[PDB]
Amino acid sequence: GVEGAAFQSRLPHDRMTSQEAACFPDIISGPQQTQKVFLFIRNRTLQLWLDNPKIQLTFEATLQQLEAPYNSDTVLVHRVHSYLERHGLINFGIYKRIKPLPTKKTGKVIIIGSGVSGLAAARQLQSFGMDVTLLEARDRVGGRVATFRKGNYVADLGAMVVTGLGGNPMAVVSKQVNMELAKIKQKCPLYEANGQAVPKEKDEMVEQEFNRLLEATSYLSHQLDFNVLNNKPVSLGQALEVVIQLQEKHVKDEQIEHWKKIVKTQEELKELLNKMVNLKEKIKELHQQYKEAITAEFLVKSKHRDLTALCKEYDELAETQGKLEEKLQELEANPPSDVYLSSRDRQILDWHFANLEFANATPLSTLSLKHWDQDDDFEFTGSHLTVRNGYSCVPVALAEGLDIKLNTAVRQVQYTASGCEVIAVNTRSTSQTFIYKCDAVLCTLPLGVLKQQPPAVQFVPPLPEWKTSAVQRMGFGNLNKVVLCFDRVFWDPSVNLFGHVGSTTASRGELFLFWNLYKAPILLALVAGEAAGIMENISDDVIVGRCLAILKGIFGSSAVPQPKETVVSRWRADPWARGSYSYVAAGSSGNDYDLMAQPITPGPSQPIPRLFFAGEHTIRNYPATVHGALLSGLREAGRIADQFLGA
Ligand SMILES: Cc1cc2nc3c(=O)[nH]c(=O)nc-3n(C[C@H](O)[C@H](O)[C@H](O)COP(=O)(O)OP(=O)(O)OC[C@H]3O[C@@H](n4cnc5c(N)ncnc54)[C@H](O)[C@@H]3O)c2cc1C
């Protein structure tokens, strides 16, 4: 109940957030019980919205739907309700309005980009009564959530999975858009470059190795301050190499201590065979004497009294000859490993790297080893899902009733303390251009776009140093996919995933994974790490060929017709994107995502914020995702409304 609401809202259910404390400075300085009441109303209200997010949740509705000691402080409830509504915590996505939108509209805002962050914010601003318009360079909305659809085929070339619903706003949006989510089975059989499979231990041993290795990386950073080596920020790749070497080293040592023992023992067997050989010389000599044989009766008794002493010693040695050799054996039969890495084991340990690079959108040498997991104390509760209906349904549903200008690429953004102007061009006819006047501009331009040195969008006035330093510092990875549409299915339906073991450590992530989750005859081969960019420079036919080759190596040549339809993404070559999403670069931190979020005041000639930023690269705890983009939009729509409503 109520407690699960605060959760689905990324909110403490017994504490007040820094924000809530600022907007309610009275309740914070005020007693406790009162607060406890606040938290309840707050929690209850979210429950109500969360229980049915397909219809607007009004103050009035929030009043009779209450317990009896609460439905009485009308004022607090209203305060709380407005707070929640303002910040996009209780009235976002696509819902039914019960009260038509005002006929006239306060301010004027221009939003650059029809991505999820764009549509999300525009949608908020529109209900806050502002005048919004969106300029999109492409001929469709969604942006980095692209959906391929031909015949009965449908696949996501962009965003593909919903990473859990526990606290994920995509849960609300999901029930609003009517989204068909299907869980992804946690099972991936790894096949080898030659065409065939991995035992099991092989996988269990490596995956184990992967984990422990990655654990070290962590231990060295936080626990040891190992992130600034030779006036340079330490990389993940770096640490992964430091680590492996010390493990490669431990192996050498053991192979040496072993070799030493084996050696010593061999030398002792030699020094014994010698002592034996030289003892028999003495023995044999007594059997020469014993044969020639009162002092002949006491002589024979003595020589045989001695010859039984030497012989009793020759047995001592024969006892060592056995106890030593015995030990000699042990060492050759139970000897340690030659390497910590087989030409194969490594080639497999790579996969787990490729996979890691695929998740991060960039090779490890580029990840700030110190900060690549600040976003982890913020993950969702639940199995990761997919959208077999096409993630494109979310943005297409949010794009309803909005003034969106497609095929309109922005070239310049001028902003002053008297207003702002946006200049764009028709991507279908450069002959015609446009000018848009507005009070505020909301930039949701991909970070890979704000990085093109020969700029695609010129700001006037250009933009402070701190803003650009952040842009230069932050990372923008790449990651692509191949779509294979087949006549029929030729792989286990029980198999959602399954990887390709790459030959070289440099080509670790080239077609290192195949998806099938598409409860249909559709296959997705992925490209991560260094292969991402590079491969974008290859004809589709050639890329497909490599795929069929890889697959034919698992089900043999004939259980694999040619695809009926095929598609290849190239998010780096795409002008409207210039990559996949952000990643914490070696010399950057979460603080940089905060800088990218900070708005810009344009004077003077007493200034007010005119240029605002939202997008997958402006949200600290949820970067590189669809929910981060959507949350960023809701964040700015609030900040903007807060600036232009009152003043
Ligand atoms: C291959 C791939 C797989 C992914 N998988 C996942 C996943 O499983 N889960 C997840 O949560 N996220 C995933 N993402 C990331 C997710 O899609 C993005 O985080 C999200 O789309 C970002 O939204 P946005 O609004 O910030 O920007 P975008 O959607 O990139 O939108 C910015 C918009 O501005 C437009 N634009 C650019 N320049 C101009 C211009 N000059 N004038 C006008 N318009 C312009 C763009 O065309 C675009 O429509 C993936 C991304 C890629 C590339």
Side-chain angles (χ1 to χ4, degrees):
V2 156
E3 300 300 15
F7 188 70
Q8 206 58 58
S9 308
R10 289 148 266 105
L11 248 28
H13 73 276
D14 52 287
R15 298 189 191 185
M16 298 184 103
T17 294
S18 309
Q19 280 192 12
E20 311 185 335
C23 304
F24 304 73
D26 55 301
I27 292 187
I28 185 184
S29 59
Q32 192 124 286
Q33 151 68 6
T34 320
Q35 292 190 34
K36 300 179 180 178
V37 181
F38 172 109
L39 299 178
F40 181 61
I41 296 167
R42 193 256 277 152
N43 286 310
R44 253 261 79 176
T45 319
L46 298 169
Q47 178 177 10
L48 292 166
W49 161 251
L50 287 174
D51 289 348
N52 184 187
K54 284 147 67 69
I55 68 177
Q56 178 181 178
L57 176 71
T58 71
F59 170 52
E60 197 188 331
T62 288
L63 271 199
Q64 191 57 8
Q65 304 224 52
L66 297 231
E67 200 71 34
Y70 298 103
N71 66 22
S72 24
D73 185 300
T74 16
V75 181
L76 187 61
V77 171
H78 180 87
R79 295 189 68 191
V80 176
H81 181 288
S82 61
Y83 174 83
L84 296 185
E85 199 177 40
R86 183 59 139 211
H87 297 296
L89 272 170
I90 67 158
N91 268 324
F92 54 93
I94 335 157
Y95 60 81
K96 181 183 185 178
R97 298 222 177 63
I98 80 301
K99 55 172 72 177
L101 234 26
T103 44
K104 284 60 214 177
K105 332 191 167 292
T106 295
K108 174 84 214 190
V109 185
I110 278 220
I111 294 175
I112 304 170
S114 198
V116 164
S117 65
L119 294 161
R123 197 123 184 124
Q124 287 287 288
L125 294 171
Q126 182 193 59
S127 61
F128 287 166
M130 296 193 66
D131 189 348
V132 192
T133 309
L134 296 81
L135 305 172
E136 176 59 50
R138 306 173 189 278
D139 67 356
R140 58 151 232 275
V141 309
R144 270 174 290 178
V145 3
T147 301
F148 169 63
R149 193 185 313 246
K150 219 184 190 295
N152 283 307
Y153 305 135
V154 354
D156 277 320
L157 295 166
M160 186 159 61
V161 342
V162 190
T163 63
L165 322 192
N168 183 354
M170 285 302 104
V172 172
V173 177
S174 185
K175 298 190 176 184
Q176 289 179 347
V177 157
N178 193 315
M179 195 132 101
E180 295 306 326
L181 302 182
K183 305 186 193 179
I184 312 169
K185 307 172 184 295
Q186 187 187 64
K187 157 59 188 304
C188 190
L190 300 179
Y191 294 50
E192 286 190 0
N194 85 1
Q196 342 247 321
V198 161
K200 191 161 181 309
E201 151 67 301
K202 293 284 179 178
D203 199 325
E204 190 178 2
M205 183 222 126
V206 186
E207 183 162 347
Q208 194 211 73
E209 267 321 316
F210 184 75
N211 297 310
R212 30 180 291 166
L213 287 174
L214 215 48
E215 277 180 45
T217 302
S218 296
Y219 191 21
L220 336 194
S221 177
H222 319 301
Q223 272 281 42
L224 280 159
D225 247 331
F226 187 55
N227 350 76
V228 192
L229 164 63
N230 306 311
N231 199 46
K232 306 198 231 187
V234 178
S235 171
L236 187 71
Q238 274 180 51
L240 287 199
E241 251 158 41
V242 149
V243 162
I244 291 188
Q245 284 192 41
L246 296 195
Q247 250 303 292
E248 287 234 271
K249 167 67 176 175
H250 189 68
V251 163
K252 282 184 179 60
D253 296 336
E254 309 186 336
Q255 171 159 39
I256 290 174
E257 271 70 68
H258 184 70
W259 188 251
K260 275 188 184 178
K261 299 219 64 180
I262 290 185
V263 165
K264 209 164 195 174
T265 295
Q266 300 168 62
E267 286 166 48
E268 282 194 286
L269 267 184
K270 303 182 178 186
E271 260 194 51
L272 201 52
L273 300 182
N274 169 75
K275 248 204 179 315
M276 301 192 137
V277 152
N278 196 294
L279 176 57
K280 286 183 170 174
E281 282 177 48
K282 303 180 64 177
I283 299 294
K284 171 187 178 179
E285 194 178 307
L286 285 198
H287 276 325
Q288 309 176 306
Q289 172 198 62
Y290 202 30
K291 287 190 175 180
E292 280 166 275
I294 293 178
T295 306
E297 195 69 299
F298 193 58
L299 175 71
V300 65
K301 200 170 186 178
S302 291
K303 303 308 178 178
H304 201 200
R305 180 180 174 296
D306 309 310
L307 215 174
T308 295
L310 294 181
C311 284
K312 275 207 172 189
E313 175 172 53
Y314 188 87
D315 281 300
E316 305 285 60
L317 315 185
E319 181 182 65
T320 312
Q321 186 189 183
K323 284 299 180 180
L324 285 187
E325 296 172 2
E326 182 193 69
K327 185 188 188 187
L328 190 68
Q329 287 165 36
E330 281 180 40
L331 308 194
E332 300 100 1
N334 187 12
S337 48
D338 265 23
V339 302
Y340 169 47
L341 24 70
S342 298
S343 147
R344 307 193 178 186
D345 289 40
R346 171 63 190 186
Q347 243 151 69
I348 283 186
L349 181 53
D350 278 337
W351 195 91
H352 292 247
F353 290 148
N355 198 63
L356 188 56
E357 301 185 299
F358 148 82
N360 272 287
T362 185
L364 313 174
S365 20
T366 71
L367 289 162
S368 165
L369 135 111
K370 176 147 168 268
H371 303 292
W372 69 289
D373 341 284
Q374 33 99 52
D375 64 62
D376 284 298
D377 347 359
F378 308 101
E379 5 200 311
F380 301 141
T381 279
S383 8
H384 291 1
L385 284 160
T386 183
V387 179
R388 53 149 158 170
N389 157 44
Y391 219 146
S392 77
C393 64
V394 176
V396 167
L398 300 169
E400 138 157 289
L402 296 181
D403 184 358
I404 302 181
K405 310 265 163 189
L406 300 181
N407 296 308
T408 293
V410 168
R411 285 178 146 178
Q412 189 178 308
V413 172
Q414 338 204 349
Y415 52 101
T416 64
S418 46
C420 306
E421 259 190 53
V422 183
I423 310 196
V425 176
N426 189 308
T427 64
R428 298 301 191 201
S429 56
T430 56
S431 62
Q432 45 176 299
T433 89
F434 313 97
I435 286 171
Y436 298 82
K437 330 228 72 275
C438 61
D439 296 294
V441 158
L442 175 54
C443 185
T444 66
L445 286 166
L447 170 66
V449 169
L450 302 166
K451 270 175 169 290
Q452 293 187 295
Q453 201 24 47
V457 179
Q458 175 176 26
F459 293 80
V460 195
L463 264 190
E465 194 81 349
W466 66 258
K467 196 73 171 190
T468 28
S469 287
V471 171
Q472 306 180 73
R473 268 200 293 306
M474 302 185 106
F476 200 65
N478 178 40
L479 144 69
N480 288 144
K481 307 176 183 185
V482 184
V483 167
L484 303 162
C485 302
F486 290 119
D487 259 328
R488 62 263 187 169
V489 171
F490 58 74
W491 52 84
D492 305 322
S494 50
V495 322
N496 256 177
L497 315 203
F498 81 68
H500 178 264
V501 174
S503 50
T504 312
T505 298
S507 295
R508 299 191 304 200
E510 172 191 334
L511 309 189
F512 88 109
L513 186 43
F514 289 63
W515 282 66
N516 145 88
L517 145 75
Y518 285 78
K519 338 194 95 180
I522 292 174
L523 221 48
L524 296 189
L526 309 208
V527 185
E530 295 185 302
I534 286 199
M535 307 226 83
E536 277 180 39
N537 292 91
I538 300 173
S539 127
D540 287 349
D541 290 312
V542 175
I543 291 190
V544 174
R546 273 165 129 68
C547 291
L548 305 180
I550 289 180
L551 292 179
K552 290 210 200 265
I554 295 167
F555 323 130
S557 77
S558 51
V560 297
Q562 179 134 348
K564 278 252 148 276
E565 292 296 339
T566 159
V567 182
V568 180
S569 89
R570 308 176 210 270
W571 292 97
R572 183 61 83 184
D574 180 340
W576 313 134
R578 295 302 182 201
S580 298
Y581 42 88
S582 69
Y583 70 69
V584 184
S588 180
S589 62
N591 297 310
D592 278 18
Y593 289 75
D594 287 322
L595 297 172
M596 283 294 102
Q598 230 199 286
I600 297 196
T601 326
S605 164
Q606 235 134 214
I608 59 170
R610 296 284 183 182
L611 181 48
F612 302 85
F613 300 84
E616 161 270 311
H617 59 293
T618 67
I619 186 170
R620 250 217 189 196
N621 312 345
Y622 309 95
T625 55
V626 172
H627 63 275
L630 180 146
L631 288 178
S632 66
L634 300 184
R635 179 197 60 219
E636 293 310 304
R639 195 203 302 272
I640 284 178
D642 278 1
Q643 266 300 303
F644 299 85
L645 287 204

